[PDB]
Amino acid sequence: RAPLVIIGTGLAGYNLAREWRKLDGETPLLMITADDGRSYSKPMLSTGFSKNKDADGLAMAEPGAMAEQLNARILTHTRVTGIDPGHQRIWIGEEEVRYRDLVLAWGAEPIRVPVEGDAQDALYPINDLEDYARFRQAAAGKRRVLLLGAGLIGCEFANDLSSGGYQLDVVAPCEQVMPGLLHPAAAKAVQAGLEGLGVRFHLGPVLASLKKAGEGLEAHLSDGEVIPCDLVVSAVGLRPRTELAFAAGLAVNRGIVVDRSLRTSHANIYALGDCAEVDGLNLLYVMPLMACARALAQTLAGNPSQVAYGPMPVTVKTPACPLVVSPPPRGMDGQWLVEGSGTDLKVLCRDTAGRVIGYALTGAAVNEKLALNKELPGLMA
């Protein structure tokens, strides 16, 4: 009778539900989500123009069909407002839900920045299917887009928006695209690719003030640049949602702290996907999420199981300069060598044995991904 309760109907929630329903078709299942509950592949948000798709074109199933497929009750546009571990329950406003076990699959939030001016609140985040719909409707008939951020998400959107016919300015105070992810030579190759589409980068400044001007906006940068635009996309980065777990007394660090079996610090509470920090690893992509869904499904069905991440390369969706990057496993390093030329770069990290432990591949060099993957150590030992 007491139900499995899953907070979140993104890829983590729905893949855990599906993998677990292969093992247990009789226990009640309750999923809760603050959005509309549609099943969609979030990575596809940044290909909407290049694929000629709107938000509906990206959805794979509606919540009712999902509830039927998973033999679940799914609560939509429903916001969980607290967790009460000592009583095996969660709060929604002034209502409680009791659980057999609780799964935190509630993802990451956009990183905000300080902005002044009368239009300071006219920033569009794009972090789910509803954000996207709302952005697509506002972008209809428009031409000039200012984008904040120069990470993976900002670059993919910059490339995609451009291919959609938009004029792009990218603003970020960091000194290169994808800092922390990319070797500088590789970063330089990717930036040149995007600039070749007409994207203009403003690296160093931040947005100081956003103001209504005539029938659009003027973006006042900290360096005195003032760039006219129709809309502003805020894509600085993402941070796991941890506030509610902290208040409830669960260990949090960058994400919710879980072991390789996805268990939080408290009995009967687990976590996975973007919100989870799994044995030190908070990995904001699908490959690890899927590994976690397979193992936790087992554990929730009485077969205690742990993940053991193998190599998980990141493919960055920038057709202007294709990119695959596989950072070396943490607490492991070697010499970085840049090979190739112009914008077709193969950057390899070799350990003291001479083995390739990480790489960054741009342009034509991405064709080497499948060969080089055979060299890689797993992300966990």
Ligand SMILES: Cc1cc2nc3c(=O)[nH]c(=O)nc-3n(C[C@H](O)[C@H](O)[C@H](O)COP(=O)(O)OP(=O)(O)OC[C@H]3O[C@@H](n4cnc5c(N)ncnc54)[C@H](O)[C@@H]3O)c2cc1C
């Ligand atoms: C534009 C972009 C491009 C990407 N491209 C790739 C790619 O090419 N390859 C790749 O591997 N990864 C990619 N990713 C990363 C990948 O999409 C994410 O890692 C993955 O979607 C995370 O899934 P999730 O279910 O953990 O989180 P989310 O999809 O964010 O889901 C969180 C869920 O929790 C719900 N929720 C949150 N708070 C509450 C609350 N308090 N109460 C009730 N419900 C709540 C939300 O409604 C949502 O259903 C991309 C991400 C972005 C945004």
Ligand SMILES: [Cl-]
């Ligand atoms: Cl990012």
Ligand SMILES: [Cl-]
């Ligand atoms: Cl941060």
